[PDB]
């Protein structure tokens, strides 16, 4: 599917050949393998001679540790002036930085009063009951009758044991976590009952209240009994309605501290309690932080619904505090902390999200800090000052967790580059200027001081004993950056930076074409030709001035040298000379485009498509938005006599209509546009219509776009060609710019990355099909050769082996990195390189045809159009319109803003941007990889033919590791002035080919780093912090059986790198505790929290559940565990194979199990062993997460090769249907609403099933220590009551079938005997030692296929369609493991 372009009518008259002539004029790609050496030698000679005198700059220095340390110490001396800070002062001032940090260390607490808090009175029960009633459907009447009952309950329960919990001053929380007063409600009730009494005018003032209360109670009970849930299980005392109720309310008195939140800075400088009394050694502050973070996260449940107040209670070591806020939704707001004994402890302005990683993780952090400290305790010279390290690490962790910012991420992230350059031999001089950020708040400077004090302590100039544990310590500290987030604080603020990045390098080159208009103008062609000519006019090392680094452009001489060298077979190894280069022209599916991405749809008002924005509508929208944002803010904080208010009021009086020494002309001419707009169509028109009209290219999802495109064809195959060249809407002829359907179009977006933010170009569908052809072509042609690791898997292992071998012999390594790889490449370079290669085959015609098709495709991509986001245009228009008659801000005028202004004050406004110096970021990956491979091979060959050494390369897109040989390493130690100039020539000659080296490169003899894989001599570097941070906040709003396997895979992957097993057990326990908060009945299938090391390296997922089940009921699986051995012995040989498949697989379960046990001459299981059962919800239909799967997956994988099957799959995917904390809130809310499917048709609850089980007095629950519920039921109740026993499932049958399947899928050591060995002696061990290990590696196939459908609790075949190769584990964790005989 490469030569299908011959179906269209060619039209390539005049524009096409000029570019070819420009790119093929002076490229002498015919040199031999003997002339290039002369040019290379002469270039080397002239470069060295010019460098010796000093007309060229080096950009490479020799490492000196003292200067590096001093420069790091003196890195921020403009606001933080100091020389050395004492640890005691840092500790003293750390506990008093911010209210959040001051609250976690105060001396708070109270005896028996805190013991009463372990009890719940008759006040919260009524609150929960009324919340449940209000959840269903049954207006001030309801609120009054609902918040009076809880008041009555509190009054009743305040005269029995003298306790008042759930109060604040004179306020009480009633229904929606609200805060309501006392007197106002009393008088409202009095007036409402007075109106009732007036309407009734024998009845008394105490009878109407009880009558209405009982009228509501019966309706509530009927409503709860209608669905199927009981009412008497809530434990509510109905006697709270006293006979004398009306007079009870009106004679109540109470006294307390009146609460009030603050909004300024000077109101939080008064602290009631002691400012600090907690030591860092214990884990007291972590529990408080966890509770506060949970309270903050829970603050998003509130719906829309004096004025308002919302509250959330939380306990702390007996005490009870309340977090109060005054605005709903999910965004930045004001929070205050209150108590009932004092008032307004503190107040802050935190954000509800970005607070997930600390919810129930209070012992994982302590353990990881302990295991990080345990890495350096064996240093003789670092014995005295050991507690300071622990304290500093604790402060760093607590500070990063308590104040999640974005500029604190870039500070801990850059320490890795410094520590990599510390143990190296050479480094770029522009390295210090790269480790510098812009800090604003007073907290980040404290973090910088803390990390500086820690680095100056760990890396002093008098300790050289280990020199390996400190490296791991610093590198793992630098990886705490992953603990915060990967989201973005704002949206508009981070959308202008991307546009400025996109437009910055394209303006200096002086080539910015704004509006192509889809019919190219003569000036556009002339400018494109001139820029193409200019792009190939780079000179260097042979001129009057010399080279000019860091500029876009390519030299003709080096391009000719590269092409000639490639065409002579001089860049090939000894294995490629045994064959001939193949052309993939003659040697795919379209459903791939249905992936989980986005797409853009066009819009036509006529035969043509709109491409330009309107001017008057944009002005009207800008004025409307300014008035909208003004109406509230400028009405309060603007002086009436001020000019700004006087002019903004006039501006507001232009659209709504409910001293001019400034811009009189502008204000006089702006009236007409608004008047015409309002005449042409509480505003005076429709905002929605205007917003829809101004938008030109709305977005749309991916699946339905493909479905609607496919639903108008007549081909019975799902191929790429059938959707593009054959349709009712297909191009007829194609021209120089593009097909008659129009030129290509893209749109801009940003990714979500830790640190910076990458670009993203998202195109339409036609471009999506067009790109894949070139993508696949270049991918195959690069796969022909060896050297690329972008998609390969084995060469990555080969590179790892090479790195290990190089490090083992102390050879020199070079870790590289290229900058601006995306926004400064060009498709013209690819076209010019393609037009000079010789894919030698004995067929000229096919080569010419393929080259022509590739050339025209590259030309099509050369004339692409790029869209400008709507929000950026709106913001720029607001800035222009406001700062033309007003004087509001006018602070900074960036060079990227005058570009909008100059075009604004000419008439039409910018719509698109087109140019030549931009390559699609993440679009043409394979072409760039292939070019990089060729260029690196040529550079290595040149360096080889200059000096007497050889160099390797493992380039992958933009990354590189280079491994020098022995000769270069020996040369580096005896002639530094030669090695340095060789490096200089390498840098210059790499720059000459449009490849720029970043200042973060390393030339080291101690560590190698390729794709974030550090290697040293002997030891290994486990990124424990990265894995822990990734595993912490990695849950979504899925069904609770997919999260278990999602976390299990992550833990299995992380175990194989060096993480101990106790951390994994704690993480799994935290996950189970998080699930328990949602009140989900745990089954013995989710997770196992007692795994040893053999359960991760030898056993698979199915073995851990087997081990967990083997512990719940012992002495009952032993009988089965020998019948299974006999069955395996008689089945592997081929004895029976008949009745087990049909007479024992599809029948009654218990009877068949007993018969199977009896048949093999083995004692049948005891009668009191089949009584064990477990509850399995959704045993009939799957749960409703939104408000046989094996055969269906096989169908979706095979029948989707045609049109109808693919369409059905797309329809089902469409009919399937923000944050991480929002996902948790959604999971908590959804799991508990209905989440139940009935037998025939209905929706039920979870509480109803529990009530039904509690009703029958024959079922007994059993709980494990961590908590896994499993039931015991008698055989006599096996049937007769089938209403609820349907959901239960037996235990021994599933255990047997899963054990048999696991024995089939692995060896036979599983059915041995578990004899946990622990009689081994003791040893003072070291936490730094590792041992590589390997895994434990027809009728059986269809046997497993048939067995898969019966025991439907897991999906074993799902895990098949990766498998880890080697496992690296400690030595002390490898001994104490279970052992089993064959």
Q: Which is nearer to Zn ion, 167 or 549 (CB)?
A: 167
Q: Which is nearer to Zn ion, 121 or 323 (CB)?
A: 121
The least CB distance from residue 186 to Zn ion, in Å, is 24
Q: Does 936 contact Mg ion by CB under 5 A? A: no
Cβ within 8 Å of residue 637, ≥6 positions away:
none
| Alpha helix ranges (H) inside 1099-1220 | 1101-1112, 1120-1132, 1149-1159, 1189-1198, 1203-1214
In this structure, are strands 865-867 and 745-750 parallel, antiparallel, or unpaired?
parallel
Instruction: Pick the piece of the chain touching Mg ion (CB under 5 A) from 383-391, 951-959, 1072-1080, 1129-1137.
Output: 951-959
The Cα-based distances of 1312 to 112, 1210, 1291, 1299, 1319 in angstroms read 54, 48, 21, 12, 20
Residue showing tokens 């309407």: 199
Q: Is 779 annotated as a binding residue?
A: yes
User: Which CB atom, from 100 or from 163, has the smaller least distance to Zn ion?
Assistant: 163
Compute the residue count for the chain: 1382
The smaller minimum CB distance to Mg ion, of residues 902 and 1012, is found at 1012
163 binds, among Zn ion, Mg ion, none (CB under 5 to 8 A by kind): Zn ion
Nearest distance in Å: CB 321, Zn ion: 18
Please indicate if the annotation marks 116 as binding a ligand.
yes
User: From the list Mg ion, Zn ion, none, which binds 959 (C-beta under 5 to 8 Å, kind-based)?
Assistant: Mg ion
CA dihedral angle for residue 855, residue 860, residue 862, residue 866, rounded to 10 degrees? -160
How far is the C-alpha of 174 from the C-alpha of 146, rounded, in Å? 8
Is the CB of 585 or the CB of 997 nearer to Mg ion? 997
- The answer on whether 818 is annotated among ligand-binding residues is yes
Answer yes or no: is 958 a known binding residue.
Answer: yes
Q: How far apart are CA 1086 and CA 1094, in angstroms?
A: 19
677 binds, among Mg ion, Zn ion, none (CB under 5 to 8 A by kind): none
Contacts with Zn ion by CB under 5 A lie at 121, 163
Is 121 assigned to a binding site?
yes
Which one of 751-759, 889-897, 956-964, 1267-1275 is the stretch in contact with Mg ion (CB under 5 A)? Answer: 956-964
Q: Which stretch binds Mg ion (CB under 5 A): 643-651, 727-735, 957-965, 1353-1361?
A: 957-965
Subset of residues 798 to 817 that bind Mg ion, contact rule: CB under 5 A: 817
Binding at 1110: pick from Zn ion, Mg ion, none (beta carbon under 5-8 Å per type)? none
Which residues fall within 8 angstroms of residue 691, CB to CB, at 6 or more apart?
A: 621
- Work out which of 759, 764, 959, 1348 binds Mg ion, going by CB under 5 A: 959
Outline where 277-319 has alpha helix (H).
Answer: 284-298
**Sign (positive or negative) of CA dihedral 830, 832, 833, 837:** positive
Residue 1149 CB, nearest distance to Zn ion (Å)?
50
CA 1129 to chain centre: 49
User: What minimum distance in Å lies between the beta carbon of 803 and Mg ion?
Assistant: 12
Q: How far is the CB of 421 from Mg ion (least distance, A)?
A: 14
The smaller minimum CB distance to Mg ion, of residues 930 and 954, is found at 954
Of 571 and 812, the one with the shorter C-beta distance to Mg ion is 812
Stretch that binds Mg ion, among 851-859, 954-962, 1314-1322, 1352-1360 (CB under 5 A): 954-962
Task: Give the other-Cβ count within 10 Å of 590's Cβ.
Answer: 21
Nearest residue to Mg ion, using CB?
Answer: 959
Report, in Å, the least distance between residue 819 CB and Mg ion. 12
What values do phi and psi take at 802, rounded to 5? -65, -40
171 is in an annotated binding site: no
Nearer to Mg ion, 444 or 936 (CB): 936
Question: For residue 1261, what are the β-bridge partners?
Answer: 1271
Q: What's the min distance (Å) between Cβ of 959 and Mg ion?
A: 4
Minimum Å gap between C-beta 120 and Zn ion is: 8
**Binding-site partner at residue 1348 among Mg ion, Zn ion, none, CB < 5 to 8 Å by type:** none
Specify the residue, 144 or 163, whose C-beta has the smaller distance to Zn ion. 163
Phi, psi of 35, deg, nearest 5: -90, -35
Q: How many residues bind Mg ion (CB under 5 A)?
A: 2
Q: 149 or 466: whose CB is closer to Zn ion?
A: 149
Q: Is 675 annotated as a binding residue?
A: no
Contacted by 897, from Mg ion, Zn ion, none: CB < 5 to 8 Å by type: none
Torsion of the alpha carbons at 1045, 1047, 1053 and 1059, rounded to the nearest 10? -140
Q: Is 934 exposed, middle or buried (0-12, 13-18, 19+ CB in 10 A)?
A: buried
CB of 114 to Zn ion, least distance (A): 12
- Smallest separation, CB 119 to Zn ion (Å): 6
Number of H helices, E strands in the chain: 52, 25
Residue 689 class from Cβ within 10 Å (0-12 exposed, 13-18 middle, 19+ buried)? exposed
Find all residues with CB under 8 Å of 434, minimum gap 6, and list them.
414, 417, 999, 1000
CA distance 603 to 609: 6
785 binds, among Mg ion, Zn ion, none (CB under 5 to 8 A by kind): none
- Pick 851 or 1013: Cβ nearer Mg ion: 1013
Q: How far is the CB of 160 from Zn ion (least distance, A)?
A: 8
1169-1208: contacts with Mg ion (CB under 5 A): none
481 annotated as ligand-binding: no
- Report the residue number, 121 or 439, with the smaller CB distance to Zn ion: 121
Partner whose footprint covers residue 121, from Zn ion, Mg ion, none (CB < 5 to 8 Å by kind): Zn ion
Output the CA–CA distances (angstroms, integers) from residue 1080 to 131, 1176, 1247, 1269, in the order listed. 20, 12, 10, 11
Q: Judged by CB, which is closer to Zn ion: 163, or 529?
A: 163
Rounded Cα distance, 879 and 892, in Å: 11
Q: How many other C-beta atoms can be found within 10 angstroms of the C-beta atom of residue 1274? A: 12
Range 1133-1154 burial, b when 16+ CB lie within 10 A, else e: eeeeeeebeeebeeeeeeebbe
Q: How far is the CB of 102 from Mg ion (least distance, A)?
A: 43
Closest separation in Å from C-beta 955 to Mg ion: 10
Q: What contacts 1261, CB < 8 A, 6 or more positions away?
A: 1269, 1270, 1271, 1272
Residue nearest to Zn ion (CB): 163
Distant-in-sequence, close-in-space partners of 794: CB < 8 Å, separation ≥ 6: none
Nearest Cα to 297, choosing from 1221, 1079, 1228? 1221
133: CB partners within 8 A, 6+ apart: 220, 223, 224
Does the annotation list 959 as a binding residue? yes
| Minimum CB distance to Mg ion, residue 968 (Å) | 20
Return the exposure string of 690-716: e unless at least 16 CB atoms fall within 10 Å of the residue's CB, then b: beeebebbeeeebbebbbebbeeeeee
> Among Mg ion, Zn ion, none, what binds residue 1304 when CB lies within 5 to 8 Å by partner kind?
none
The smaller minimum CB distance to Mg ion, of residues 518 and 817, is found at 817
| Residues of the binding site for Zn(2+) | 116, 119, 121, 161, 163
| Residues of the binding site | 116, 119, 121, 161, 163, 779, 816-818, 958-959, 1009
| Residues of the binding site for Mn(2+) | 779, 817-818, 958-959, 1009
Residues making contact with Mg ion (CB under 5 A): 817, 959
| Residues of the binding site for Mg(2+) | 816-817, 959, 1009
């Amino acid at each position: 599917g490469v030569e299908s372009l011959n179906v269209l009518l060619d039209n390539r008259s005049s524009h096409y050949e000029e570019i070819i002539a420009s790119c093929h004029q002076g490229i002498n790609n015919k040199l031999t393998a003997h002339e290039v050496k002369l040019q290379i030698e002469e270039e080397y000679q002239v470069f060295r001679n010019r460098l010796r005198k000093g007309e060229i700059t080096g950009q490479f220095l020799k490492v000196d540790k003292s200067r590096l340390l001093n420069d790091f110490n003196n890195l921020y001396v403009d606001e933080v002036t100091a020389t050395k800070d004492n640890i005691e002062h840092l500790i003293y001032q750390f506990k008093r930085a911010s209210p959040i940090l001051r609250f976690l260390y105060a001396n708070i607490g109270e005896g028996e009063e805190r013991h009463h808090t372990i009890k719940e009175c008759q006040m919260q029960y009524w609150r929960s009951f009324l919340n449940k009633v209000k959840s269903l459907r049954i207006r001030r009447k309801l609120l009054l009758i609902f918040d009076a009952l809880i008041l009555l309950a509190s009054i009743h329960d305040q005269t029995r044991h003298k306790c008042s919990k759930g109060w604040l001053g004179s306020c009480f929380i009633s229904v929606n976590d609200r805060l309501v007063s006392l007197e106002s409600t009393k008088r409202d009730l009095e007036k409402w009952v007075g109106r009732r009494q007036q309407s009734e005018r024998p009845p008394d003032k105490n009878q109407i209240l009880i009558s209405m209360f009982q009228k509501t109670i019966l309706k509530a009970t009927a409503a709860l009994k209608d669905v199927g849930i009981s009412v008497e299980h809530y434990k509510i005392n109905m006697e709270v309605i006293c006979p004398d109720s009306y007079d009870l309310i009106l004679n109540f008195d109470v006294s307390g501290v009146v609460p009030t939140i603050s909004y300024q800075r000077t109101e939080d400088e008064k602290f009631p309690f002691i400012m600090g009394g907690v030591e860092l050694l214990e884990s007291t502050d972590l529990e408080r932080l966890s509770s506060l973070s949970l309270a903050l996260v829970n603050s998003m449940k509130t719906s829309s619904t004096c004025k308002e107040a919302y509250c959330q209670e939380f306990l702390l070591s007996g005490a009870e505090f309340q977090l109060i806020y005054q605005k709903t939704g999910e965004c930045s707001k004001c929070y205050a902390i209150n108590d009932n004994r004092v008032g307004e402890i503190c107040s802050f302005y935190a954000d509800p999200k970005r607070y997930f990683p600390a919810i129930f993780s209070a012992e994982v952090l302590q353990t990881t800090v302990s295991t990080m400290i345990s890495w350096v305790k064996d240093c003789s010279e670092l014995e005295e000052q050991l507690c300071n390290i622990n304290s500093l690490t604790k402060m760093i962790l607590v500070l990063i967790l308590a104040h999640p910012s974005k500029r604190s991420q870039k500070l801990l992230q850059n320490l890795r580059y410094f520590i990599m350059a510390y143990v190296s031999d050479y480094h770029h001089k522009d390295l210090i200027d790269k480790l510098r950020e812009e800090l604003i708040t007073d907290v980040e400077f404290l973090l910088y001081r803390l990390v500086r004090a820690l680095v100056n302590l760990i890396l002093s100039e008098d300790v050289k004993s280990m020199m390996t544990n400190r490296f791991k310590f610093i590198l793992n500290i630098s990886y705490m950056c992953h603990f915060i987030t990967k989201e973005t604080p704002d949206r508009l603020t981070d959308q202008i930076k991307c546009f400025e990045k996109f437009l910055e390098p394209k303006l200096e080159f002086g080539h910015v074409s704004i509006n192509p208009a889809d019919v190219a103008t003569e000036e556009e062609l002339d400018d494109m030709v001139y820029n193409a000519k200019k792009f190939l006019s780079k000179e260097g090392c042979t001129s009057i001035k010399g080279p000019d680094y860091k500029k876009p452009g390519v030299s003709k001489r080096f391009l000719s040298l590269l092409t000639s060298s490639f065409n002579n077979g001089s860049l090939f190894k000894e294995s490629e000379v045994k064959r001939e280069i193949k052309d993939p022209l003659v040697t795919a599916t379209a459903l791939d485009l249905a992936s989980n991405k986005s797409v853009v749809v066009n819009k036509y008002t006529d035969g043509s498509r709109v491409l330009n924005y309107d001017f008057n509508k944009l002005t009207a929208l800008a004025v409307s938005q300014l008035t909208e944002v003004f109406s509230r803010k400028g009405k309060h904080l603007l002086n009436k006599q001020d000019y700004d208010y006087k002019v903004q009021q006039a501006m507001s009086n232009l659209v709504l209509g409910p001293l001019d020494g400034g811009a009189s002309v502008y204000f006089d001419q702006l009236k007409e546009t608004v008047e015409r707009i309002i005449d042409q169509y509480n505003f005076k028109f429709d905002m929605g219509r205007l917003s829809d009209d101004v938008r030109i290219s709305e977005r749309e999802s991916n699946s339905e776009a493909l479905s609607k495109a496919l639903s108008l064809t007549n081909c019975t195959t799902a191929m790429l060609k059938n959707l593009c060249f054959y349709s009712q809407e297909s191009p007829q002829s194609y021209s120089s710019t593009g097909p008659d359907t129009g030129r290509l179009k893209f749109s801009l977006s940003y990714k979500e990355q830790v640190g910076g933010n990458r670009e993203l170009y998202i195109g339409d569908l036609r471009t999506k099909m067009f790109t894949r052809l070139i993508e696949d072509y270049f991918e195959a042609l690069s796969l022909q050769l060896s050297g690329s690791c972008l998609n390969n898997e084995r060469e990555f292992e080969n590179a790892i082996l090479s790195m290990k071998l190089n490090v083992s012999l102390a050879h020199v390594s070079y870790s590289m990195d290229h900058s601006k790889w995306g926004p400064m490449m060009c498709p013209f370079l690819f076209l010019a390189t393609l037009q000079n290669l010789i894919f030698l085959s004995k067929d000229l015609q096919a080569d010419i045809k393929g080259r022509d098709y590739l050339s025209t495709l590259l030309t099509w991509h050369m004339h692409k159009m790029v869209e400008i986001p709507f929000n950026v245009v709106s913001a720029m228009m607001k800035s222009f319109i406001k700062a033309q008659l007003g004087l509001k801000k006018k602070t900074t005028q960036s060079i990227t803003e005058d570009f909008f202004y100059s075009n604004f004050q000419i008439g039409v406004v910018p719509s698109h941007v087109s140019s030549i110096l931009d390559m699609g970021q993440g679009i043409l990956h394979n072409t760039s990889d292939f070019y990089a491979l060729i260029s690196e091979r040529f550079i290595n060959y040149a360096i080889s033919c200059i000096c007497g050494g050889t160099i390797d390369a493992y380039t992958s897109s933009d990354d590189q590791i280079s491994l020098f040989d022995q000769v270069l390493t020996e040369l580096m130690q005896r002639d530094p002035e030669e090695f340095k100039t060789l490096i200089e020539f390498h840098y210059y000659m790499s720059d000459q080919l449009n490849k720029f080296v970043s200042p973060k490169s390393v030339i080291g003899r101690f560590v190698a780093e390729f794709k974030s894989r550090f290697y040293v001599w002997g030891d290994e570097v486990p990124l424990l912090t990265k894995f822990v941070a990734a595993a912490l906040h990695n849950i979504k709003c899925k069904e609770p059986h997919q999260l278990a396997e999602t976390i299990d895979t992550i833990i299995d992957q992380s175990v194989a790198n060096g993480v101990p097993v106790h951390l994994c057990n704690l993480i799994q326990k935290r996950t189970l505790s998080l699930l328990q908060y949602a009140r989900y009945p745990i089954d013995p299938f989710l997770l196992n929290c007692e795994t040893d090391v053999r359960d991760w390296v030898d056993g698979n997922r199915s073995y851990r559940i087997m081990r967990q089940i083997e512990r719940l009921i012992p002495d009952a699986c032993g009988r089965i565990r020998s019948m299974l051995r006999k069955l395996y012995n008689k089945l592997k040989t081929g004895q029976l194979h008949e009745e087990f498949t049909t007479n024992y697989l599809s029948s009654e379960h218990l009877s068949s199990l007993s018969n199977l046990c009896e048949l093999l001459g083995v004692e049948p299981p005891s009668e009191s062993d089949l009584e064990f059962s477990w509850l399995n919800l959704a045993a009939h239909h799957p749960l409703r997460m939104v408000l046989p799967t094996i055969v269906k997956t096989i169908q979706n994988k095979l029948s989707s090769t045609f049109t109808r099957g693919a369409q059905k799959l797309l329809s089902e995917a469409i009919n399937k249907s923000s944050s991480i904390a929002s996902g948790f809130v959604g999971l908590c809310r959804t799991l508990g609403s209905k989440c139940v499917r009935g037998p025939n048709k209905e929706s039920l609850y979870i509480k109803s099933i529990q009530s039904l089980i509690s009703d029958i007095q024959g079922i007994e629950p059993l709980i494990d220590s961590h908590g896994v519920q499993y039931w015991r039921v008698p055989l006599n109740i096996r049937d007769g009551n089938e209403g609820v026993i349907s959901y239960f499932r037996p235990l021994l049958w599933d255990y047997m079938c899963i054990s048999l399947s696991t024995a089939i899928e692995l060896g036979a050591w599983v059915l041995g005997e578990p004899k946990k060995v622990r009689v081994l002696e003791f040893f003072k061990h070291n936490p730094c030692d590792y041992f590589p290990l390997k895994p434990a590696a027809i009728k059986f196939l269809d046997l497993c296929v048939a067995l898969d459908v019966n025991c439907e609790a897991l999906s074993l075949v799902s895990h098949i369609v990766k498998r880890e190769e080697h496992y690296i584990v400690l030595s002390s964790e490898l001994r104490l493991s279970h052992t089993r005989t064959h």
